[PDB]
PDB file of C-alpha atoms and ligand atoms in Angstrom:
ATOM      1  CA  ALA A  34      41.112   1.204 -34.024  1.00  0.00           C
ATOM      2  CA  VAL A  35      44.911   2.431 -33.492  1.00  0.00           C
ATOM      3  CA  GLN A  36      47.537   0.426 -31.792  1.00  0.00           C
ATOM      4  CA  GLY A  37      48.811   1.701 -28.755  1.00  0.00           C
ATOM      5  CA  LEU A  38      47.626   3.762 -25.794  1.00  0.00           C
ATOM      6  CA  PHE A  39      46.169   7.451 -26.463  1.00  0.00           C
ATOM      7  CA  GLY A  40      48.961   9.884 -24.583  1.00  0.00           C
ATOM      8  CA  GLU A  41      47.791  13.199 -23.072  1.00  0.00           C
ATOM      9  CA  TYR A  42      50.681  15.483 -21.411  1.00  0.00           C
ATOM     10  CA  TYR A  43      49.862  18.137 -18.982  1.00  0.00           C
ATOM     11  CA  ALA A  44      52.410  21.028 -17.776  1.00  0.00           C
ATOM     12  CA  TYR A  45      51.802  21.785 -14.061  1.00  0.00           C
ATOM     13  CA  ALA A  46      52.936  25.077 -12.947  1.00  0.00           C
ATOM     14  CA  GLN A  47      54.015  24.532  -9.090  1.00  0.00           C
ATOM     15  CA  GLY A  48      52.801  27.980  -7.468  1.00  0.00           C
ATOM     16  CA  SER A  49      49.914  29.115  -9.814  1.00  0.00           C
ATOM     17  CA  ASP A  50      48.362  25.621 -10.235  1.00  0.00           C
ATOM     18  CA  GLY A  51      49.040  24.731  -6.444  1.00  0.00           C
ATOM     19  CA  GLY A  52      51.085  22.879  -4.568  1.00  0.00           C
ATOM     20  CA  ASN A  53      53.679  20.040  -5.452  1.00  0.00           C
ATOM     21  CA  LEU A  54      52.231  17.311  -7.116  1.00  0.00           C
ATOM     22  CA  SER A  55      52.271  14.401  -4.650  1.00  0.00           C
ATOM     23  CA  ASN A  56      49.236  12.133  -4.901  1.00  0.00           C
ATOM     24  CA  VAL A  57      46.700  10.408  -7.378  1.00  0.00           C
ATOM     25  CA  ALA A  58      43.628  12.304  -6.599  1.00  0.00           C
ATOM     26  CA  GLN A  59      45.347  15.813  -6.776  1.00  0.00           C
ATOM     27  CA  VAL A  60      46.657  14.672 -10.207  1.00  0.00           C
ATOM     28  CA  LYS A  61      43.225  13.368 -11.426  1.00  0.00           C
ATOM     29  CA  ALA A  62      41.526  16.588 -10.481  1.00  0.00           C
ATOM     30  CA  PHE A  63      44.031  18.828 -12.442  1.00  0.00           C
ATOM     31  CA  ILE A  64      43.591  16.300 -15.353  1.00  0.00           C
ATOM     32  CA  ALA A  65      39.910  16.368 -15.513  1.00  0.00           C
ATOM     33  CA  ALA A  66      39.785  20.333 -14.987  1.00  0.00           C
ATOM     34  CA  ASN A  67      42.247  20.890 -18.006  1.00  0.00           C
ATOM     35  CA  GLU A  68      42.974  20.129 -21.511  1.00  0.00           C
ATOM     36  CA  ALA A  69      45.940  18.426 -22.512  1.00  0.00           C
ATOM     37  CA  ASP A  70      49.107  20.566 -23.472  1.00  0.00           C
ATOM     38  CA  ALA A  71      50.326  17.932 -25.946  1.00  0.00           C
ATOM     39  CA  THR A  72      48.728  14.586 -27.124  1.00  0.00           C
ATOM     40  CA  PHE A  73      51.033  11.549 -28.407  1.00  0.00           C
ATOM     41  CA  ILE A  74      50.725   7.797 -28.935  1.00  0.00           C
ATOM     42  CA  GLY A  75      52.145   5.433 -26.399  1.00  0.00           C
ATOM     43  CA  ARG A  76      53.576   2.289 -28.433  1.00  0.00           C
ATOM     44  CA  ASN A  77      56.174   1.250 -25.916  1.00  0.00           C
ATOM     45  CA  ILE A  78      55.857   2.357 -22.251  1.00  0.00           C
ATOM     46  CA  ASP A  79      59.582   2.393 -21.394  1.00  0.00           C
ATOM     47  CA  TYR A  80      60.225   6.468 -20.806  1.00  0.00           C
ATOM     48  CA  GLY A  81      63.073   8.149 -19.025  1.00  0.00           C
ATOM     49  CA  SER A  82      64.998   8.186 -17.138  1.00  0.00           C
ATOM     50  CA  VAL A  83      65.669  11.920 -17.736  1.00  0.00           C
ATOM     51  CA  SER A  84      66.945  14.703 -15.204  1.00  0.00           C
ATOM     52  CA  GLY A  85      66.213  18.280 -14.978  1.00  0.00           C
ATOM     53  CA  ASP A  86      62.535  17.891 -14.553  1.00  0.00           C
ATOM     54  CA  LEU A  87      60.065  16.200 -16.861  1.00  0.00           C
ATOM     55  CA  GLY A  88      58.779  19.469 -17.510  1.00  0.00           C
ATOM     56  CA  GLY A  89      62.218  21.180 -18.614  1.00  0.00           C
ATOM     57  CA  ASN A  90      63.093  22.324 -21.859  1.00  0.00           C
ATOM     58  CA  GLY A  91      63.229  19.454 -24.254  1.00  0.00           C
ATOM     59  CA  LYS A  92      62.551  16.765 -21.615  1.00  0.00           C
ATOM     60  CA  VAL A  93      59.280  15.352 -22.349  1.00  0.00           C
ATOM     61  CA  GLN A  94      60.699  14.547 -25.843  1.00  0.00           C
ATOM     62  CA  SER A  95      63.835  12.683 -24.477  1.00  0.00           C
ATOM     63  CA  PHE A  96      61.532  10.902 -21.988  1.00  0.00           C
ATOM     64  CA  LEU A  97      59.097   9.540 -24.663  1.00  0.00           C
ATOM     65  CA  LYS A  98      61.890   8.062 -26.710  1.00  0.00           C
ATOM     66  CA  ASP A  99      60.712   7.033 -30.028  1.00  0.00           C
ATOM     67  CA  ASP A 100      57.109   7.826 -29.022  1.00  0.00           C
ATOM     68  CA  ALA A 101      58.333  11.608 -28.894  1.00  0.00           C
ATOM     69  CA  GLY A 102      57.868  11.611 -32.893  1.00  0.00           C
ATOM     70  CA  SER A 103      53.885  11.525 -32.149  1.00  0.00           C
ATOM     71  CA  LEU A 104      53.716  14.471 -29.946  1.00  0.00           C
ATOM     72  CA  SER A 105      50.987  16.918 -31.298  1.00  0.00           C
ATOM     73  CA  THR A 106      53.510  20.166 -30.050  1.00  0.00           C
ATOM     74  CA  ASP A 107      56.182  20.847 -27.910  1.00  0.00           C
ATOM     75  CA  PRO A 108      54.484  21.438 -24.577  1.00  0.00           C
ATOM     76  CA  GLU A 109      55.146  24.571 -22.367  1.00  0.00           C
ATOM     77  CA  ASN A 110      57.715  23.943 -19.970  1.00  0.00           C
ATOM     78  CA  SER A 111      56.976  23.375 -16.263  1.00  0.00           C
ATOM     79  CA  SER A 112      58.175  22.440 -12.787  1.00  0.00           C
ATOM     80  CA  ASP A 113      55.978  19.296 -12.781  1.00  0.00           C
ATOM     81  CA  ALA A 114      54.353  17.354 -15.152  1.00  0.00           C
ATOM     82  CA  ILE A 115      51.571  14.675 -15.616  1.00  0.00           C
ATOM     83  CA  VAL A 116      51.130  12.007 -18.678  1.00  0.00           C
ATOM     84  CA  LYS A 117      47.673  10.038 -19.059  1.00  0.00           C
ATOM     85  CA  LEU A 118      47.460   7.051 -20.996  1.00  0.00           C
ATOM     86  CA  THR A 119      44.434   5.480 -22.243  1.00  0.00           C
ATOM     87  CA  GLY A 120      43.243   2.464 -24.485  1.00  0.00           C
ATOM     88  CA  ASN A 121      41.589  -0.763 -24.363  1.00  0.00           C
ATOM     89  CA  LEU A 122      43.561  -4.082 -23.581  1.00  0.00           C
ATOM     90  CA  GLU A 123      43.540  -6.244 -26.529  1.00  0.00           C
ATOM     91  CA  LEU A 124      43.707  -9.339 -24.569  1.00  0.00           C
ATOM     92  CA  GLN A 125      41.611 -12.628 -24.356  1.00  0.00           C
ATOM     93  CA  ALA A 126      40.028 -13.476 -21.275  1.00  0.00           C
ATOM     94  CA  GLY A 127      42.333 -14.302 -18.485  1.00  0.00           C
ATOM     95  CA  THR A 128      44.436 -13.105 -15.397  1.00  0.00           C
ATOM     96  CA  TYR A 129      46.889 -10.336 -15.885  1.00  0.00           C
ATOM     97  CA  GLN A 130      49.240  -8.333 -13.858  1.00  0.00           C
ATOM     98  CA  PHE A 131      51.450  -5.002 -14.250  1.00  0.00           C
ATOM     99  CA  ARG A 132      54.732  -4.337 -12.865  1.00  0.00           C
ATOM    100  CA  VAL A 133      55.932  -0.555 -12.755  1.00  0.00           C
ATOM    101  CA  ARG A 134      58.979   1.241 -12.322  1.00  0.00           C
ATOM    102  CA  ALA A 135      58.624   5.182 -11.920  1.00  0.00           C
ATOM    103  CA  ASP A 136      59.649   8.177 -10.546  1.00  0.00           C
ATOM    104  CA  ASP A 137      57.297   9.564  -9.073  1.00  0.00           C
ATOM    105  CA  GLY A 138      53.979   8.330  -8.590  1.00  0.00           C
ATOM    106  CA  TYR A 139      51.490   6.495 -10.597  1.00  0.00           C
ATOM    107  CA  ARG A 140      47.898   4.769 -10.810  1.00  0.00           C
ATOM    108  CA  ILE A 141      46.544   1.927 -13.433  1.00  0.00           C
ATOM    109  CA  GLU A 142      43.046   1.324 -13.740  1.00  0.00           C
ATOM    110  CA  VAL A 143      41.419  -1.470 -15.514  1.00  0.00           C
ATOM    111  CA  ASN A 144      37.550  -1.427 -16.221  1.00  0.00           C
ATOM    112  CA  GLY A 145      37.644   1.156 -13.046  1.00  0.00           C
ATOM    113  CA  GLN A 146      39.507  -0.785 -10.673  1.00  0.00           C
ATOM    114  CA  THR A 147      42.792  -0.013  -9.354  1.00  0.00           C
ATOM    115  CA  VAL A 148      45.320  -2.818 -10.421  1.00  0.00           C
ATOM    116  CA  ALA A 149      48.641  -0.813  -9.527  1.00  0.00           C
ATOM    117  CA  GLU A 150      49.597   2.372  -7.950  1.00  0.00           C
ATOM    118  CA  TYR A 151      52.451   4.194  -6.089  1.00  0.00           C
ATOM    119  CA  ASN A 152      50.389   7.024  -4.594  1.00  0.00           C
ATOM    120  CA  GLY A 153      53.304   9.390  -3.672  1.00  0.00           C
ATOM    121  CA  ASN A 154      56.598  10.764  -4.657  1.00  0.00           C
ATOM    122  CA  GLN A 155      59.646   8.455  -5.034  1.00  0.00           C
ATOM    123  CA  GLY A 156      63.202   8.022  -6.647  1.00  0.00           C
ATOM    124  CA  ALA A 157      62.955   5.119  -9.404  1.00  0.00           C
ATOM    125  CA  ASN A 158      61.144   2.232  -7.966  1.00  0.00           C
ATOM    126  CA  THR A 159      59.721  -1.079  -9.094  1.00  0.00           C
ATOM    127  CA  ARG A 160      56.470  -2.177  -7.902  1.00  0.00           C
ATOM    128  CA  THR A 161      54.389  -5.181  -8.598  1.00  0.00           C
ATOM    129  CA  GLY A 162      50.747  -4.610  -8.993  1.00  0.00           C
ATOM    130  CA  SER A 163      47.866  -6.762  -8.124  1.00  0.00           C
ATOM    131  CA  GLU A 164      46.714  -9.782 -10.362  1.00  0.00           C
ATOM    132  CA  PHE A 165      43.347  -8.918 -12.250  1.00  0.00           C
ATOM    133  CA  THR A 166      41.006 -10.889 -13.982  1.00  0.00           C
ATOM    134  CA  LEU A 167      39.352  -9.424 -16.913  1.00  0.00           C
ATOM    135  CA  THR A 168      35.371  -8.980 -16.265  1.00  0.00           C
ATOM    136  CA  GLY A 169      32.419  -8.433 -18.340  1.00  0.00           C
ATOM    137  CA  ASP A 170      32.841  -8.525 -22.168  1.00  0.00           C
ATOM    138  CA  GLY A 171      34.409  -5.625 -22.696  1.00  0.00           C
ATOM    139  CA  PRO A 172      36.034  -3.385 -24.228  1.00  0.00           C
ATOM    140  CA  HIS A 173      38.369  -3.794 -21.251  1.00  0.00           C
ATOM    141  CA  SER A 174      39.468   0.009 -20.562  1.00  0.00           C
ATOM    142  CA  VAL A 175      42.633   0.869 -19.207  1.00  0.00           C
ATOM    143  CA  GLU A 176      43.773   4.248 -17.573  1.00  0.00           C
ATOM    144  CA  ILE A 177      47.250   5.296 -16.379  1.00  0.00           C
ATOM    145  CA  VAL A 178      47.737   8.360 -14.593  1.00  0.00           C
ATOM    146  CA  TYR A 179      51.590   9.222 -13.586  1.00  0.00           C
ATOM    147  CA  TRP A 180      53.521  12.220 -12.490  1.00  0.00           C
ATOM    148  CA  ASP A 181      56.683  14.007 -12.067  1.00  0.00           C
ATOM    149  CA  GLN A 182      56.894  16.345  -9.101  1.00  0.00           C
ATOM    150  CA  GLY A 183      60.332  17.542 -10.261  1.00  0.00           C
ATOM    151  CA  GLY A 184      64.190  15.936 -10.481  1.00  0.00           C
ATOM    152  CA  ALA A 185      64.434  12.662 -12.211  1.00  0.00           C
ATOM    153  CA  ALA A 186      61.534  11.406 -14.389  1.00  0.00           C
ATOM    154  CA  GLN A 187      60.989   7.694 -15.076  1.00  0.00           C
ATOM    155  CA  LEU A 188      57.962   5.369 -16.238  1.00  0.00           C
ATOM    156  CA  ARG A 189      58.374   1.684 -17.354  1.00  0.00           C
ATOM    157  CA  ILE A 190      55.165  -0.242 -17.340  1.00  0.00           C
ATOM    158  CA  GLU A 191      55.323  -3.924 -18.026  1.00  0.00           C
ATOM    159  CA  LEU A 192      52.188  -6.397 -18.230  1.00  0.00           C
ATOM    160  CA  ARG A 193      52.141 -10.325 -18.149  1.00  0.00           C
ATOM    161  CA  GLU A 194      49.769 -13.142 -18.015  1.00  0.00           C
ATOM    162  CA  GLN A 195      49.651 -14.931 -14.729  1.00  0.00           C
ATOM    163  CA  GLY A 196      52.261 -17.970 -14.987  1.00  0.00           C
ATOM    164  CA  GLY A 197      54.109 -15.949 -17.659  1.00  0.00           C
ATOM    165  CA  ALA A 198      57.084 -13.568 -18.470  1.00  0.00           C
ATOM    166  CA  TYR A 199      56.777  -9.562 -18.360  1.00  0.00           C
ATOM    167  CA  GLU A 200      56.576  -7.806 -21.609  1.00  0.00           C
ATOM    168  CA  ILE A 201      57.223  -4.082 -22.123  1.00  0.00           C
ATOM    169  CA  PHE A 202      53.472  -2.840 -22.027  1.00  0.00           C
ATOM    170  CA  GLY A 203      52.367  -0.903 -25.371  1.00  0.00           C
ATOM    171  CA  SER A 204      50.904  -1.575 -29.102  1.00  0.00           C
ATOM    172  CA  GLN A 205      51.246  -5.563 -28.355  1.00  0.00           C
ATOM    173  CA  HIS A 206      48.758  -5.538 -25.656  1.00  0.00           C
ATOM    174  CA  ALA A 207      46.422  -1.906 -26.189  1.00  0.00           C
ATOM    175  CA  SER A 208      44.584  -0.073 -28.713  1.00  0.00           C
ATOM    176  CA  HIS A 209      42.726   3.354 -28.897  1.00  0.00           C
ATOM    177  CA  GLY A 210      39.837   4.634 -30.973  1.00  0.00           C
TER     178      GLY A 210
HETATM  179  O1  BGC B 301      63.421  13.172  -3.194  1.00  0.00           O
HETATM  180  C1  BGC B 301      62.981  11.747  -3.578  1.00  0.00           C
HETATM  181  C2  BGC B 301      62.926  11.598  -4.901  1.00  0.00           C
HETATM  182  O2  BGC B 301      61.862  12.496  -5.666  1.00  0.00           O
HETATM  183  C3  BGC B 301      61.961  12.450  -7.000  1.00  0.00           C
HETATM  184  O3  BGC B 301      60.897  13.181  -7.395  1.00  0.00           O
HETATM  185  C4  BGC B 301      63.122  12.755  -7.623  1.00  0.00           C
HETATM  186  O4  BGC B 301      62.969  12.571  -8.993  1.00  0.00           O
HETATM  187  C5  BGC B 301      64.295  11.913  -7.076  1.00  0.00           C
HETATM  188  O5  BGC B 301      65.608  12.359  -7.558  1.00  0.00           O
HETATM  189  C6  BGC B 301      64.275  12.237  -5.449  1.00  0.00           C
HETATM  190  O6  BGC B 301      65.101  11.304  -5.141  1.00  0.00           O
HETATM  191 CA1   CA B 302      58.395  21.999 -23.907  1.00  0.00          CA
HETATM  192 CA1   CA B 303      57.157  19.987  -8.030  1.00  0.00          CA
HETATM  193 CA1   CA B 304      60.893  13.093 -10.103  1.00  0.00          CA
HETATM  194 NA1   NA B 305      48.213  25.632 -17.696  1.00  0.00          NA
END
């Protein structure tokens, strides 16, 4: 098992690939029908802010900060961009909660259930997700989708245990195979 989350980056070209990115179902549909343009490992999910489009030349590299060194290639540039992060939560039984600052939207699912989302376009804003209690014996899957419709782009995910303090989400909390 590898520490951190498995990262996938998708270039989306408004026009040829369809309309502006603006909702989770649309983003998920593009992901499901396409192979990622680059992969990476998300060890510390504190990315951006960058301006001039996440899909702009050199921009995903700047956005990913120290995680850029794990990109499999320099993906093609585009108007819009999608990131997916997947792994298993390396957590004992408990009740946890995400807080996310993002531009634009995102959805976090744990064991297939939505636990945080901003289903739309927005300037960078911070939103607290719902408390969730791990259910079943696991592994406890986590799946994050995120997009930039254009302009500025930021994604910072924090995780806490109920009654505790937020920590930047990453290798401390998740692994993948
Ligand atoms: O239009 C609302 C917001 O949309 C975001 O996608 C842009 O990155 C912001 O710069 C803009 O303020
Ligand atoms: Ca590029
Ligand atoms: Ca767009
Ligand atoms: Ca944006
Ligand atoms: Na493409």
